[PDB]
Amino acid sequence: KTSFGSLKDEDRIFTNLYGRHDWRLKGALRRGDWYKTKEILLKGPDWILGEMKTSGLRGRGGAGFPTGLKWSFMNKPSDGRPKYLVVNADEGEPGTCKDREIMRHDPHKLVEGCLVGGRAMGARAAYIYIRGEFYNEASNLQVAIREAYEAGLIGKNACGSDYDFDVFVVRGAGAYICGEETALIESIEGKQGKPRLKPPFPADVGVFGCPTTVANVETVAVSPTICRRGGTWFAGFGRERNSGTKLFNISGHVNHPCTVEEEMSVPLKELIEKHAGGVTGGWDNLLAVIPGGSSTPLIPKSVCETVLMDFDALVQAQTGLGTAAVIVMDRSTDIVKAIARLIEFYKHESCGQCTPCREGVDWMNKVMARFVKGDARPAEIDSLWEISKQIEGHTICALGDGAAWPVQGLIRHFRPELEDRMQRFAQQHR
């Protein structure tokens, strides 16, 4: 199929996204969950990993790495140490709400995916590191986990199989950087949320020094339905190498900001006009869009006209598909102030380990504040571009890249706006 979108409700993988249909275990069994899971576990780890590889599911964390290959990193025999699955329920990126929605409205999908992924890797426990601000979501997840333990779906007989698994929930304490892979591992281990270098990879040294695999909530939540319904089906959705369904959050200046499940490779304009009710004032009033959450740069209306919603499509459009969090800005907004607020966010949420990210993102925050006021000079635009290029690729984790990229997008597209602000400031202060 050349065109994508208009996903069928019977093909929606995240039924009960809107809080109906009794999120507890009885409603999960009515909607279809924990079905043939014993058959899946007895079918075994190699079959599950081959199912993931044939489905072609990619990380849904924003990373974009092939889930099947990443999970098949740990198909080794035993070492002496246990193995762990870790789920990232931190969801700290601006624009992103999908993990919160699925944890509070269909948590048994997350629990079943923890069990299936833990069996696929070969493991004894899944630590769900949830965000600290999601107290009600964490309590609902604990209610679901207690119901699964009472039903015998976890612990000493995984759904009647001879596999032993445990599911723990550990809450954060308010750090966006703890959504990172190794920083989350450190936060579980009880230190500060500072990411560690790679190598060693988490598949060799993770939490407590054990082989671990860190996976997104949406990834593990679509995992057991991928195993159950094939994977050729999941690859049938979406384009080549960008396959399946995706939870798009749409926020900002849209008529109905909402979280909706939609097929991959759907047009941005089609997605907004079909699910968000359109831009406030119209598609002509649309100025810019951030398609990923906050780590991805801007795309203006001109390229937003025809862009698709793939990793490859946004890479071609000099952006990325991160958490699929379409932030929409119409013409009646301060785009420089929005980008400066994003740099404020990255300055406040930097963990402070690397000198590049630490000092450079503080520097970016000050330069962007002066850009918003107008008291800069047009040479400082290229100076800020070089500061961004110095930050990017020179840090331990990708928060430095995710702070450099919105600056690069703003400089790339809305440079006459910055120059206009500077000349207006200069002529009004002289």
């Binding site: 040479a379 400082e380 290229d382 100076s383 571009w385 070089e386």
Partner: protein, 56 residues
């Protein structure tokens, strides 16, 4: 500069050359000792961009 016409004529004739045009005592044509403040220019490599030290 403060010499009579007869003495100037005698000096010019004795020297063979005109002396009042190029006399070796400085009176007023020199610069004032108090000068306005300068504003010295910055040279190249003050560019704030495309100015890595490894390229120069």
């Amino acid at each position: 500069a403060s010499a009579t016409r007869v003495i100037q004529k005698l000096r010019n004739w004795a020297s063979g050359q005109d002396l009042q045009a190029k006399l070796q005592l400085r009176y007023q044509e020199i610069a004032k000792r108090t000068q306005p403040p300068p504003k010295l220019p910055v040279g190249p490599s003050h560019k704030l961009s495309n100015n890595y030290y490894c390229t120069r």
